[PDB]
Amino acid sequence: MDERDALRISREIAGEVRKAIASMPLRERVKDVGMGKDGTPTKAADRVAEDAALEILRKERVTVVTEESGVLGEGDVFVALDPLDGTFNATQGIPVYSVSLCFSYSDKLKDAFFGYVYNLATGDEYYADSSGAYRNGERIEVSDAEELYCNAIIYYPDRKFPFERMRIFGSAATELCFFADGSFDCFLDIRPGKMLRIYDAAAGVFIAEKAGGKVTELDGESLGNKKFDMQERLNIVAANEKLHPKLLELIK
Amino acid sequence: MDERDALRISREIAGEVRKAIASMPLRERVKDVGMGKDGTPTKAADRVAEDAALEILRKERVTVVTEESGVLGEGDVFVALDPLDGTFNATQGIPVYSVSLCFSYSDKLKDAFFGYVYNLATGDEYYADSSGAYRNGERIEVSDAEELYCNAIIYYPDRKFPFERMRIFGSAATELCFFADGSFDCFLDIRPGKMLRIYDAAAGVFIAEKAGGKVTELDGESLGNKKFDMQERLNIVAANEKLHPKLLELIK
Numbered sequence: 107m108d109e110r111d112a113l114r115i116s117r118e119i120a121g122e123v124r125k126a127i128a129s130m131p132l133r134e135r136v137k138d139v140g141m142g143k144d145g146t147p148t149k150a151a152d153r154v155a156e157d158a159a160l161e162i163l164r165k166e167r168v169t170v171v172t173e174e175s176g177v178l179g180e181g182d183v184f185v186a187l188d189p190l191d192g193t194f195n196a197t198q199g200i201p202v203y204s205v206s207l208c209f210s211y212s213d214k215l216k217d218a219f220f221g222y223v224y225n226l227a228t229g230d231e232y233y234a235d236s237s238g239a240y241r242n243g244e245r246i247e248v249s250d251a252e253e254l255y256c257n258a259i260i261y262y263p264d265r266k267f268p269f270e271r272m273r274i275f276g277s278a279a280t281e282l283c284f285f286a287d288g289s290f291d292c293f294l295d296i297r298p299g300k301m302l303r304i305y306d307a308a309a310g311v312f313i314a315e316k317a318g319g320k321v322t323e324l325d326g327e328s329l330g331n332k333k334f335d336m337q338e339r340l341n342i343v344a345a346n347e348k349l350h351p352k353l354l355e356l357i358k
Numbered sequence: 359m360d361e362r363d364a365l366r367i368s369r370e371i372a373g374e375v376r377k378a379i380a381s382m383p384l385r386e387r388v389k390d391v392g393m394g395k396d397g398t399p400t401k402a403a404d405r406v407a408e409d410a411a412l413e414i415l416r417k418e419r420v421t422v423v424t425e426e427s428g429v430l431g432e433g434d435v436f437v438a439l440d441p442l443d444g445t446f447n448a449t450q451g452i453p454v455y456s457v458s459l460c461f462s463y464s465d466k467l468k469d470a471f472f473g474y475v476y477n478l479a480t481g482d483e484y485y486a487d488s489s490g491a492y493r494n495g496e497r498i499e500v501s502d503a504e505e506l507y508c509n510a511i512i513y514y515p516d517r518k519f520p521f522e523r524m525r526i527f528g529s530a531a532t533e534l535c536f537f538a539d540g541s542f543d544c545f546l547d548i549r550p551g552k553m554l555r556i557y558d559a560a561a562g563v564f565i566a567e568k569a570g571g572k573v574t575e576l577d578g579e580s581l582g583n584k585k586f587d588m589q590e591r592l593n594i595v596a597a598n599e600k601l602h603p604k605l606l607e608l609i610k
């Protein structure tokens with residue numbers, strides 16, 4: 107498989123998932139229909155998303171690692187799938203929720219060759235391949251903010267901070283893209299519990315780096331060795347090269 | 359003027375403001391074109407919104423209190439107008455920004471008879487009148503959550519909190535409506551600076567109360583005497599009547 111296949115596949119998936127969710131009323135979306143392999147409830151909105159995405163992905167030779175159904179398939183190409191990221195928003199009809207896909211040539215993030223995040227409520231399309239990073243067909247890049255007085259997405263603020271704005275939109279995959287396109291100056295998930303799973307962050311990290319951002323773990327460590335498995339967990343500190351080390355200091 | 363006139367007027371305004379913003383590219387939206395009477399800069403997105411709104415409102419016998427141009431007109435009916443609430447989101451193409459209108463028979467919020475918040479990115483319509491509170495024509499009401507382990511919109515978290523979720527979307531008028539329709543269990547603006555202006559909150563507070571929520575200042579004082587002027591500022595604690603006192607305690 108190559109980055110063209112992955113774009114094609116991701117778009118087909120985006121199409122079907124969007125259709126499926128859009129036809130499900132909010133009262134159905136919000137129903138708890140099962141337990142996911144990740145250890146959190148699967149809502150009806152999650153199940154329909156994942157079913158639609160897997161219908162397409164299983165026709166391919168990949169190992170899929172996805173939130174509700176866990177690990178599936180046997181291909182040498184690994185795909186990290188969040189069939190619905192921002193499920194709470196989707197259940198409330200709040201326009202920030204996405205399907206997220208990251209394709210890698212091994213079970214480690216350093217081998218990612220394609221990343222794709224699609225806002226299911228608005229139609230906004232983010233992806234990145236070897237040619238750069240895109241939002242709705244147009245090249246994007248991270249902001250050049252250097253001061254701590256910047257616009258931050260942060261999970262979660264638990265002390266006074268120097269930021270100009272703090273926002274928390276409820277979909278990490280999309281919010282990483284809000285960072286990737288310059289909307290926000292940084293994305294921080296510093297929750298001590300280390301809550302992000304590989305399928306939450308992977309596409310967002312790949313897109314953000316291709317947009318020029320520096321994206322690391324809590325302590326500046328590379329994310330390259332994060333595994334595409336259900337056990338993997340992440341903290342993220344992401345910002346342009348100038349701002350990144352300042353934030354690392356700040357959150358010490 | 360009555361509540362039906364206000365619905366009509368608000369819808370006409372929503373239509374034109376939506377048109378005006380939609381046709382304006384993000385690179386133009388974000389331009390700083392002037393200073394607002396509020397004391398914050400006026401973005402070109404703000405200006406085109408306010409102009410479209412005032413074109414319609416001036417044709418009415420009202421006193422308008424609006425962010426960019428301040429206090430206008432002479433009528434006995436006061437209208438608090440945020441022509442564009444969530445301007446930052448609108449400049450980045452993040453789908454949470456709104457026009458907000460609150461109509462009152464005096465210059466105090468206790469005399470409000472109509473409130474209206476319209477998401478310019480999605481077309482979502484919130485309003486409340488004597489018949490109740492609505493979202494896209496459907497009656498809404500606040501959530502029945504009783505525990506501090508709830509879903510919270512809070513500006514800004516600065517300590518450890520017991521919430522299940524914390525979100526900050528960047529449009530106070532809309533976020534009060536997220537509270538009003540039950541999507542979130544509470545809305546909290548407890549920023550010590552007391553930042554919210556009357557046009558940010560008025561419509562949201564009226565809609566939230568009509569939806570059954572309890573909405574007060576920091577200390578539980580009624581918001582009834584808040585003035586429709588440029589000097590007015592607000593903190594807000596809003597939740598159902600069961601949860602509300604617990605939150606008052608939590609931040610005490």
Ligand SMILES: N[C@@H](CCC(=O)O)C(=O)O
Nearest residue numbers: 117118120121122229231
């Ligand atoms: N909304 C599109 C997503 C991909 C695209 O065509 O840009 C679809 O129907 O698949």
Ligand SMILES: N[C@@H](CCC(=O)O)C(=O)O
Nearest residue numbers: 124225226227228229230
């Ligand atoms: N129309 C978009 C999403 C829905 C919308 O337009 O709001 C799409 O085809 O994906």
Ligand SMILES: N[C@@H](CCC(=O)O)C(=O)O
Nearest residue numbers: 368369370372373376483
């Ligand atoms: N007020 C909405 C339309 C609602 C309606 O008239 O049914 C708009 O013009 O943006």
Ligand SMILES: N[C@@H](CCC(=O)O)C(=O)O
Nearest residue numbers: 228376478479480481482
């Ligand atoms: N502002 C457009 C958004 C388009 C859409 O989300 O369908 C509306 O009237 O709804």
Ligand SMILES: [Mg+2]
Nearest residue numbers: 142146147148
């Ligand atoms: Mg789950």
Ligand SMILES: [Mg+2]
Nearest residue numbers: 173188190191
């Ligand atoms: Mg999910």
Ligand SMILES: [Mg+2]
Nearest residue numbers: 394398399400
């Ligand atoms: Mg201003």
Ligand SMILES: [Mg+2]
Nearest residue numbers: 425440442443
């Ligand atoms: Mg404004």
